[PDB]
Amino acid sequence: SRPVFKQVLKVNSLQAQRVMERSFERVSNSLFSIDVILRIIGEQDEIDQVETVILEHISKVSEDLDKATAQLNKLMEDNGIDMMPGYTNPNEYTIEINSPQVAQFAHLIRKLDTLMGIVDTLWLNTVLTSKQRTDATYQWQQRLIKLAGRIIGIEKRARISAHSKGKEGEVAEAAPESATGDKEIADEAEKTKA
Ligand SMILES: [Ca+2]
Incomplete structure (x- = not known):
């Protein structure tokens, strides 16, 4: 009756793993509740006013990971770095996707995983200091958490x-x-x- 997309999502970096473990299922249940609290509300100008602001926040985070990914993926070209690292313990999460907004949040976690992969080789190739790495990891971890x-x-x-x-x-x-x-x-x- 209602479509549900089930998918196995492997996550390499410890930052994206932690974001996934403490936020996803809560956010998955939150977007579900929003979708039904809205049809109970009913008034469409308000339903388009919450999603447009829901999907804007999802868009702004998506936009800023794309631009961070862009600048750092050409710091590797500026230093001739082709490859990314292995990870000593990647994990696979079975997730179900009841609404497109859950897909985009789950896709945000992937783009964070990639961004950490980029930062990790730039750190390993001595292009970024240890601090630059932990500020990338902490602030980007925090960015999806908020x-x-x-x-x-x-x-x-x-x-x-x-x-x-x-x-x-x-x-x-x-x-x-x-x-x-x-x-x-x-x-x-x-x-x-508030
Ligand atoms: Ca926008």
């Missing part, structure tokens, strides 16, 4: 919107809100709720 947090924050603003419109009980039976086990993600969601 993106996760803000999706969830957007989801919590939709729930309060449903409350004011009387539909509190209707979404407590269609989509109960899940706990956010990551404190960084929960903090960014509560800022995005």
Whole structure:
């Protein structure tokens, strides 16, 4: 009745692995709740106003990984570096994709995995210092984490919107809100709720 795309997603870098493990299933459940809290809300100008802002945030992160990937993939050409490294422990995650927005978040994690792969060889080829590597890894790890947090924050603003419109009980039976086990993600969601 409803399409669900199931896919095995291998992740090499420890940064992309950690982002995936602490944010994905929460974000996957968050975009699911948003999609149903919206049809319970019903008003289409608001439904197009949340997705356009949902898919903008997903787009801005996607845009900035593309530009980071571009500049660093030609630092390797400037230094004649062809190859990427092996990874001592890549992992494979079985993920299901219920909406296109889940696909784009899962595709963001892949582009982060690639970006870490680029940074890792530029670090290994002595083009980037140890600090430049950890600032890339930390800030890019953090960048998707707050993106996760803000999706969830957007989801919590939709729930309060449903409350004011009387539909509190209707979404407590269609989509109960899940706990956010990551404190960084929960903090960014509560800022995005104000
Ligand atoms: Ca844009």
